[model samples]
Structure formats: structure tokens, C-alpha cells
Target: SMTSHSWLCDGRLLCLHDPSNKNNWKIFRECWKQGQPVLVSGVHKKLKSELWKPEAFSQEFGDQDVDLVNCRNCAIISDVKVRDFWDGFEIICKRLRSEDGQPMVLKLKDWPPGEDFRDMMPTRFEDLMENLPLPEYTKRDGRLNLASRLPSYFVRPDLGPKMYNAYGLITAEDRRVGTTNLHLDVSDAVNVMVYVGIPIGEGAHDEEVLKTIDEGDADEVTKERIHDHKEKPGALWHIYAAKDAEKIRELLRKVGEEQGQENPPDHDPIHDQSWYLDQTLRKRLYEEYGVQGWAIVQFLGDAVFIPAGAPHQVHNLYSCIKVAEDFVSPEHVKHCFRLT
Candidate 1:
């Protein structure tokens, strides 16, 4: 069963997870397919007032209205990688039978997740340079700049805004530490998650299965397992597209008009930024416009596309890295005034 919050005002479930029990698996399908808005007490009137403003996006966009394509280009990066035991070892070794039916040496893990792993692993490079026997060449300098050197093959010059910045950790295994926080940008730009991978343990599976937990129909033990598993290691989770232009417009309008002008203020200080709105808008936009939408991209892997004005949040799960981009487009400008 999905619960509705009055703040949404539109008869929709604003928060994915149950507020009564934050640990509960979100009723994704119900809210996604049938959740409606409901009214609640206005005890938090000031906050509600700010949240209900009519020009939040207008204020965030400021002088220049954001274009959808440009917003898409402004990438929002997130880390999505698999969970494995060998993730921590700087070097790994494996034994395999040779074609000749004899024991052969199979070495893996000299570099990072991909090709750059080879370039960064000095020990592997040194071993290879010396013609010494080492299994693989995958290592890095552990610096942000060195780790983020995008290869020409992976670059998409025509895809997004020129301004790009990585905002989270870049480890092979997605962890729950400092990376759990959310971000929103001003321009309703992009929120991207690159290098999505499968996760291990509990919720590491897919959303189709997780949705069952929210129906209040799943076994109690399974439900409890999901709740407890989310905070612990081995559970699966995912990021999915979340977008709705009309809702975005409403939220934007509310924030833009009331923020800073009202007495009690109307925005959550932690997430009251252009970047934050941009990220949220993009996530919702992806859900509305993209395929097989889910809020969080889980271990199975996915690249999330967050459109402008969509609100979104990250959940507890494995480790990942994310990048942010900002840009403008003409097509989006042309359709700015028309929204459902």
C-alpha cells in the first residue's frame, strides 16, 4: 500500500518510502501506477508554504530558460558497480587448466574497472615492463583527476553540456558511506550515472521484485529482510527514470515564488539549490519519458537520465561514482510553455 503526503498537492505519493517506517521498501508500482495526493495537517505550514510556491523553477532558471536537450546533456553522474569479494584486493590471482591439461596461471585485477585500469597500475606496468610474471595490469593513482581520465572511445561530445564535474566516490564496489547524500542543481540540467553494474546480496536484484515488498503482500520475513538488508551489505537496489513536466513546473513555481520572500521560509535548506532541483527534475523526467523506470538504479545496472524539474533521491546501497553537467537547448525552449 502506498501512502500519500499532502505536500504533493497533486494526489500523488511524494516520498517513495513509507515515512512511518523509512526502512520499508517503497511502494514503487502503487505510487507509480496509482498513488494519488492526499491532504495532511499543516503543522509544518512554513515549510509547506515554501514547498507550495508557484515559481520555483522560474527562479532557478532565472534569465535563461533551460532546454530539454541541453538539460539532458548536463550529465548527473552516479556509481553503479557490482559487489564481489575480490573488489578489495589490489591484486588478484586465479588458477586455470591450460589447453595442455596442465595447471596454468590466470591473473586478474591489475587495474581499475575498465581499460584505464591498465594505465593506472604502476606495479602491473612495472611488472609488465620488466617482463616479470604478473596476472593483470589494473591499478590507479587513487587521485580523482587520474581516475576520471575519460577515454576517447567513451567520450560523447555531442551528448551533454561542456561543464562536467564528478561528485561522488569512484571505487569498484558501490558502498554506503559518505556517498548517500543527494544533490540538486539550479538549471534543471542533468543527473547521470555511468558504469552501472550488478550488485550482490539482498536488494541487489531488480525493482520488479522489490515492488512486491511495498504491496504489503510479501512475506513478513521477506519484508523485514528487505528493510534490514537495505542498510546492510549485499542488498540490491537501482536507479530509475522519474520525470513529469507538469509536476516539475508546479514544484518549480512554488519554490521560485516563495523561497527567500516568505517569513518562515519554504524550502528545505539542505536541498534548496538549483542543482538539487535539476537532479530531481531529471530523475522524474526520466521516469515519465524513459523506459522501465525505477527511482534508484540497483546492482543490475542502469544509466539514469534526469530531465529538468524532477525531484529525486538516492537510497542506501552499493558504492558508485557520479558526474554532473549543465547546458541549454533550443528544442526545450520552444516547448517550455506547454506542459501537462
Candidate 2:
């Protein structure tokens, strides 16, 4: 049963043209208050060229020890070198091959790996942390985030300006085998896509062949060829409103029953991180539950703001470097309390 849904499930998100504009910030606040995701363009354009690349990360922290999570199962594989990981990353950037079997997709646990950002200030990533890609728009000390503002009074949580790096994976099945599975955070976040590599492949023909084919065939071949070179290499996001959380659980519970699970797990359906809602499932959500969501394509230099307690997932179309920071906003502070 096919449905008319783009890779961007419902449609694209409302875009904020300029992040530096005061009017645009007001627009962002309005969207966040109502639990909507907004894509702010050119948020990372001011950063130095070398700051967001894989080679620079490998060179700066080459000897650093870190853990990598196998995206297929979320298993933490320990003690891998930064140099080795990025060195092998060249294959994905150049060929976009999935090897001979199920692709082994690994993402660094968190850059500045495992150390608390407060104690470890002035680390290489500190530059990026201090100058958070988006403006800090919180009420208490609007200049500072809760984590930084309350550091002296109470033991603060590790609200990070964490860097995430991983090779892109392309899976044919509608499984949660991409960058991240459906999950929510206690605090609102803005994820900036710094760099995106080309997903050049065999089926991706050269421009000459593409030009010839566009003029000759405009049927099934043309329809399926849409994804070829059309997308700006970046991460795709599926974000649902906080209120629809229970209906999502209900849908997953029903699907699990069909698969003979008898009872769904105690945690929410998203906690499993095992399913990716394809066209059919998205249609079910809209038709049955009356739930629709923001489908965002986060390209390089784009910052996607995710409201607190909203279920979301990301599918990266190519190798990407992203920096995400969580903040307790006045608008979504209620969710922080509820989630905790």
C-alpha cells in the first residue's frame, strides 16, 4: 500500500530566513511556543572553514580515545582512535558504498568524549560551544543558558555543545538504521549541520547522462530518479509535536501486537529506536491519529530548532558533521519539568 509522502513526510518546515534578525527570532519563539520546528538558514556560515571538517577534527584530537555506537543496534564499542575512524570515513564520502553486507554505521558517542563541558572548558570544541550556533534566548540571564547560569549554585546537568560525526547510511528497508532513531530530549535544542559530503554512487549518473535521460524518459525511471543528485547532502528530520506522543505509542503498540509481541515494552515506542515510519506508516498516523509533523531537510549551514519533549529522528543522506546544544527555554520549560 503506497502513499503520497515525500522523503520529507508531510512537507518542508517553515524557514526563518535570517537568524541574526530580531523579527526572525520572534518568529522562532512563536513556533517553539506552539511546538513546531523551524529551519534557520546560514547559521554556521561565519565559522572558519577548517573548524567543521572531518580532517581538522582528526588532526586536533587524533590521539583522543572515544566510544562509537553501532547505529544498527546502538551498542557502544569502546576505545577507538579519532584518526582511524576519520581515515576510514573517506570511503563513504567518495563511493557511498554499504560494503558487502548490512552497513556498519558508527557515530562518536559525543565529541570532547565523555568529559563534562563545564570542567573541560577551553577544549578545542569550546570555541563552537561558547559561540552556540543559535542565539541563547532564555529568560534567566538571557545571555546564558541554564546549565551555564546555575553552575555555581547547583550541580548542573551536562547541557552540551556536543559534536556528532558519522558516516551516512542508506538502507532500503524502513528500519531505524540511520543517524538516530525516534527520541525526545528534556530540553529544547538547535542542531547545526556544519558540513555535508557528496553521496556519489554508481546509480548516480554523470550530468551528461542525466541531461540525456531527462529529455528521453519521463515515466517510472524519472519518478524513481528523483533522489539522484536532487537533494542537498544533509540530514533529514522527522519531528512530531509533544501532544502526539501517546498516539504514537498507541500506533506502535498496535503494530507490535500484529508482530506477536503480545505487550509493548514499558518505555515509549521511540525508546526502542527500531522503526522508521515510511510512507504507509505516516499515512496511518495522519488518517487514524490525526497527527502530522514537520518534515525538515537540514542542509549545511542550517540550524533546526527542536522543541522540548518532541519525538524526532534523523536520516542523513551523506556523511555529515553536526553540532547540537540543548537549552532550557522559558517557553518549553514545562516540558523539562514533565520529562524529569
Candidate 3:
């Protein structure tokens, strides 16, 4: 069935080991043409001191209200002040784990939802705008950045910078859990991991990691591990090339039929962000359809460049804070138009 933990890890997806490399843009352009997803590590360090830190977020907008979603079901729990949410973070996690029979992952959805940071938090937005990790490639006005080149009338109000914060319910037993469903975006975008927190408890490696209520030794070292990218990857990604979109749709439809859904709503399986391609589905995707995918391990300070309309899914290995901005790229403009 599965050879390696549910998916294949293809090394070819990593386009740039270091974002600071002078030839990064050149190399990125090459990958872009192939409609493949690329992972660029070591971009987080380029941001100004502490601007990307979790603490900076708390200090800047602790009182702001945020919406929390139950990742297991993709339903919003409710809205609460950012500070209040963090204050009770541990308590909520513990209660969910003990009270429920399943692993419950909660996510802070699109932090500062709906409003552009430029108008909501001017100074912080200025800092982030000035220090975008891959300015040469991601800057809105960059020649290849289609999002920035669009006429004002064509711009979508929601197309802008946003943050995603999710908790990873990892244990010594379970290495990672799917935090997002299989989906695609209309515009190409880059998602950058800024902060990552260690797993909740240590267990007998690779099992469902259960919680260890006592902070003790677990809390001390795990705190420092956040700054060390070599220690552990913060998230896992499965990205498929846009050319395989129809093949994927056929596969999803076949699976849905077997699962008793007379027809997936809208005749599209991915319309709702509810289906996670578990080990079984991922195996079938490769074995039956012969569609190859990139399984990427994203570390802190890494940026994952997702091609427009390229289906992708994410699983967080640690509680992580990531910022993502969508841009139109000339290479994927055709896909973008199709999605629109």
C-alpha cells in the first residue's frame, strides 16, 4: 500500500534552498513555467528583527477580535479577542483532547478577517510591506507579479495579505494531522511560515500523540526548537500540477461515488473544503491515476509558491503562524482565467 508515511516525498519540488541567493528569481521563473509548486527555505530570516515573531502579533493587535474554526469539521467556533484566545489556548486544547474521542485541531482563520492590513493596521502593514520575504518575486509591483499589475477596477477586494494560525495536535505517536482540505486557488500565491510551536506531547514515536498535561521538560526545550528550522518541519504540503486537474477530478468523483454521495455538490468534489486526502486516497491517486505529486516539508522561514489552479492541501506539524499573499503570475494567467 503506502511506502512512506502515506505519501511520496519528491525532492524535485524544492526550487531554492535559500531565498537570498542572487539567482533565486531566475530559478523560480524556470519552475513557474512548468506549473509545479516550489518550496523556498530560509526566507523568514530576511524580515526585519522580530517583525515575523508571534509575540509581535500579540503586542500589535492583542485586543483585536479573531474567528476560530474547528479544523476537524471546518466550522467556526466563534469570535473572541486575540488576547483572550491565546490566554485560554492551552486550556481549550486540553479540554478538546480529553473530552473528544478524536484529535481536534482548531485554527484562527484569516487573522484580522475581511479588512486589508493597510487600512486596519497601517504601521504594521508598512513594516510587512517593506520586508516581504521574497520581495523580488512576491512584491505586488514586481514585473511578474500579476496581482499588482491589475487595473484597480479588476482588483478583488479580498485579494491581499492575510495570516493563518493553526494548532497542531502532534504527539510522539502521530507526526502530523491534516489541517486543510484538498483545494485550489484562482491566483498564484506564496505562503510563508513565520512561527512554529512544538508539538503538544512526546509519545512512543509515530502513534497518535496524546497530550501530556504537565509542561515540565516538554515545554522548555520545545520553546527553543521554534527558532531551529533543522529540528522539525512546521507543515506538510501535497501539491499536484495543474495539468492533472481533470485526472484528479475523475478520481475524486470515483471515490465520492463509492462513499455513497450520489453526486458531490456541483459535480465537483473539491467545491467544499471538507475532504482530506487521507493515506488511502493519496495512495490511490498515485497508484490508479498515475498522477505524481510533490510532498513538501515546509520549515520555518520557508515560502511555498503555489501555482494558480494547482490543487494543493496542507497539514501542519506544529502550531504555526503563516502569512500568505496572492499574486497573478504571467505563467499561470491562463489557469487563473479558467478558474475565474
lDDT of 2 by residue, 154-221 (tens): 33435456677886654543233557877777677778787876544332523432332232222332
Candidate 1 lDDT over 254-286, as tens digits, reads: 555656435233445335423232234444434
Candidate 2's C-alpha runs over 4 A off are 1-12, 73-76, 93-103, 115-134, 138-157, 174-176, 199-231, 262-266, 338-340
Rank order (by lDDT, best first): 3, 2, 1
- Identify the candidate with maximal lDDT: 3
Query: Largest TM-score belongs to which candidate?
Result: 3
The collision pairs in model 3 are: 147-328, 171-209, 172-203, 173-206, 173-207, 174-207
> What's the lDDT for candidate 2?
0.62
Please give the RMSD to the true structure for each candidate, in Å: 22.1, 7.5, 7.5
Residue 67, model 2: Cα distance from true site in angstroms:
2.7
**lDDT tens readout by residue for model 3, 1-94:** 4111111133355446556555566656766788877766666666764665555666778888777776655667666677654543333334
RMSD of 2: 7.5
